[model samples]
Target: GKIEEGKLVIWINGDKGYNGLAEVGKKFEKDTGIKVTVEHPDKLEEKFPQVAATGDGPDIIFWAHDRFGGYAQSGLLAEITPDKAFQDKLYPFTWDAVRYNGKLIAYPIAVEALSLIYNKDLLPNPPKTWEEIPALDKELKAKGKSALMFNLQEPYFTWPLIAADGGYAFKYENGKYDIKDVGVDNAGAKAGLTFLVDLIKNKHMNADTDYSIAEAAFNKGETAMTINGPWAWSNIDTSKVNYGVTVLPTFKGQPSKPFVGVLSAGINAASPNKELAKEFLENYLLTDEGLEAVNKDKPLGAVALKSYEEELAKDPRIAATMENAQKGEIMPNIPQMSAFWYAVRTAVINAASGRQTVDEALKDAQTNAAAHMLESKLIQHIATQYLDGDHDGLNAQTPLFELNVVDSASIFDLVDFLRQESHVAIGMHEIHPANFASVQAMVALVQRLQAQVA
Candidate 1:
């Protein structure tokens, strides 16, 4: 009762492997005379929304900014309007994640994205382009080692290559994500995947290589360079390994863009201590004392405070994170991105294993993602059709002829019949003239049906 009487509870993701919560909470309690309790639940992502719905949750909830969308959409997060002073402090891409639907919903805490962590002893100097890797591989192979390797089968490590070649998951328009617009199988992705395939084939790299294997090889002096995130930094045995970090090497004089994973804090919209949470996050954590405390226990890819930039720059690990993050793309936080990851992961693994052609695997990934996301449209019957507002033959509302009305019988029956015999994916999408041909056919059907009725 004594502890609960004057305390504000903060639920954080304990998965960070270190706790700055005690320092921050202790400082907050000291400064404001209000006790602060921090709880890091194992299943915070699933449990947070569940418990918040019951009118009981943490005052300050901390997690990745990606989770902000779901929490904000469900009305479980409050809109936090950071003042000009505060807004000026975070990285640009970070702002992209802290806000959802154009509203600031979370406070940027720390950023941990993937970068190229290489052992200084083996490489001596990092290769500037993908072309150099093969040469180095040959040299290292002669010495009973390999040049460059990463978690070869991982979708996360594949991002740098994918993005460097100009591939992206979704198209952002007007400060919001257009979920309907997916760009997984675009030309850029094909180019990037092609490059990766060539590299794997020539280097004798296995598609099934995992993080542990890559790390073991690097640490045991069997490999020169290993591309990984900061999470693997702690595992690097400095006694056996002298490592240096940097952004993903360039493809063709262009920067390889990695995914920036931002850790952020937010105020629980349902909590009774909104003011307390806001003050603690904004005033306390961002303060010199608090930020110092945070970096004290394993610097998690530099905190979001720009004021600490110079200090953070001093550490190679933190500097590498900042450099990589500045050039990298922010991973999409929307729920649609959920399917995208699975699709990309499967595509990466399939391509890596040589079980499927790179082109086929990537193409299948996009198709699978479409099927997963278009679930709402795929199962629905042909109830809604073209808008005949001005008695026009064609309208924007008419998605396709396969799902619209027909003369004697509806197109669904015919389409469904056609589907039974073969596979005809039915959904509205943006492509080229074939879609125009379909609309023209639908309009022709409309014209013929009107004449028959007359």
Candidate 2:
């Protein structure tokens, strides 16, 4: 209770060292009468889900909406709908993210987007579309230079280029998503793909280099332009480079769109001090002053509704960044969408690396995507397990039996049992060298029992 009284626990994804979020946390504790305990794990992908699974996560955390879908669907996110009255004062896109099936889930703090950050001295006027880039490439090639750069390994960062050619990952039909509408194989996406291929063929772009390498090349003026997000701003030496930001120019009237991300806060559903947390977030955190202070040290844009007003928009960079964001699509929060990243990456690597034909790569990606969707059904199975029986792997056998073991048993006790019992080994812990036959038998038994009980 002492920790909860004067202090709050914040679990950040990675090392707090030199991270922008950590710096803001220090400022937040100084301005507010609250102590913050920061916990950082090396692998956030694993740690985040583990913490949330136990219902003992941080009061506030920084994560992408796309990654939070699994938690949200399983009811791990706190329902903060009652706080929506104050949240209505924030940006519409920010508010739109919080609502899931008519319930509010999180609060927005900062907004971010990807844009074309170019060296103004080299590219006085950046190319507006995929069409204009080839000429620029030719001009640069004559001078032993390259027109632009990006990490071919990361397809998400290359989305703007793909969008310029009219490619999109998802499509909405009659107010619902239809995944059958894949755009990666469409004419526009193919055009974007061809553009990158031509650049590589002409020796204008290097497919082997990573983002850091490309960024270094750009910073040293070795490359003319690159597509990057606001997170890349703090690390770059803007004074030396004549850098400029702008909306990606379109090809054939199709606008270049990037993934729009928002940093948000959500109260714990299990917290006893929900009212206090709500008050702290609404009255103190969401205010213009609070939001501004949180974003001041970092180059992140504000989530407050007034961010686009005259005073805040005075800075041309901020104004242009906001304009670009207006053209961006809100990144989806559907849990199943995580599969798309791997699928897209495989397709891109195959196409870019020439390891496989584009058509073959795309076919492989689509097949893999379908498999991932099928695999995600395991989540439903796990949820059913949690709902039906105790963590101790016990349930009443007789129909007349009213006793509930789950209501009385502790999860820690179940952990102790699994730790000691050779037959009930925990997968990640005691079952390092698991017996496949035994594991399959156990799974069959559980499934049979579940069917009988249902």
Candidate 3:
């Protein structure tokens, strides 16, 4: 009853990209006599969390690194301490994706980023700078084609334009994100958005562009180029498109900065087979043969394992993707990034659709995002002291009362805490439950009181 003898379990998203795992598993079972089973449950991401909360989930999981922060904060993910030698085998930025609050929470498997993809058959020489794109667009129009296309409304695809200078969703520093320092409305971001808007207004790009539209056009050899990532290779490979991959060229004299995402794996904190899982991850998963197997059928856009680099880089496409990923920024995995997505998506859609000017959209984004980034010192202290120093998943939108983190009896303590921390007077009349309903509510209440004081 204490242990499930000589068996291991892994949860992955699908079977297509991971058929190589079957071979690796056979080898593992032969060497250690440990039966290994991998399962691809439908809606696994939604299901795993529910099972994990009850300590009844798979022993191991392969997932995107962005979920690591919430999993670690909720005490559902095991902390991993791979040795320096093992850590050195992967690119440095991949580690940043899985690290949360000074803890190495997952093993980095692969890295991916958006890049410039072109049709060599259509155009022999690719433009190396932004200045040449419009002229190329004009030239392609003569051939009944467009020079470049991508999901025009997607923040992930368009982020390179905004981030080439200094645009970012959050100010990441010292291994943590200062959530309050949202940068979407800064001058650099505004300039980038202006350029993007100008491209559409000038008819250099299709106003109705989206992922499918671009993908279909590229596959049919109607469009000369498209901006995409490794994930799209499967679609591109299925068609007979003579595509060439390259790092996105500089945007207005600045290097393009795409958002990078890392695929990672980790042991579940509540697993009974933690030791066996750790051993398997270290000895089998990180090996060159194992990496090759995992990447064989559905290859990662950019492989992170250094030992597999030389062989994988033999493909010129993979080499260009690796180069682009090296220059990209790892998407911040903090809970606050949730707010950033909402803010950026709103800004992009509004600005691109002509519903709002770039400046108006970004300024609204800043306000909307700042309202949800309740990481100020006072709130941090409140979260810590009130929750006995354990406040991992707390955010602006988290319901204070629904979660039972705050109650009527504790309201006075919070009010006093706020008063003491901010040196602002709080009247008894302002102690309504509405003002104490959530972190956002409290922040709004505090800001109002601070304004009164000023």
Candidate that scores best on TM-score: 3
* Model 1 lDDT per residue over 1-454, tens place: 2113345788876665236767788888887889877777788789889888777767778788788788888888888878887788776677887777788888888887777878788787888787678888887899888887788766788878887878888888666888767777877787888788888888646666788898888888788788887778778856368888876788767788888878888887777666777788888887666777766764556777877765777877778888888888887888788668878889888887678887899877866675555432322322333333233333334445343345344444534533442244433332222432343333333333334555
Superior by lDDT: candidate 1 or candidate 2: 1
User: Model 2 off-target regions past 4 Å?
Assistant: 1-62, 82-88, 172-183, 297-299, 302-304, 308-313, 353-360, 375-454
Off by over 4 Å in 1: 1-7, 15-19, 353-356, 375-454
TM-scores vs. true structure, each candidate: 0.79, 0.69, 0.81
Clashing pairs in 1: none
Q: For residues 43-72, could you state the per-residue lDDT of candidate 2 as single tens digits?
A: 654565676666666665556565555566
**What TM-score should be assigned to candidate 2?**
0.69
* Lowest lDDT block of 10, candidate 3: 370-379
| Per-residue error (Å), model 1, residue 97 | 0.8
**Model 1 global lDDT (CA atoms, 0 to 1):** 0.72
Ranking by lDDT: 3, 1, 2
lDDT of 2: 0.61
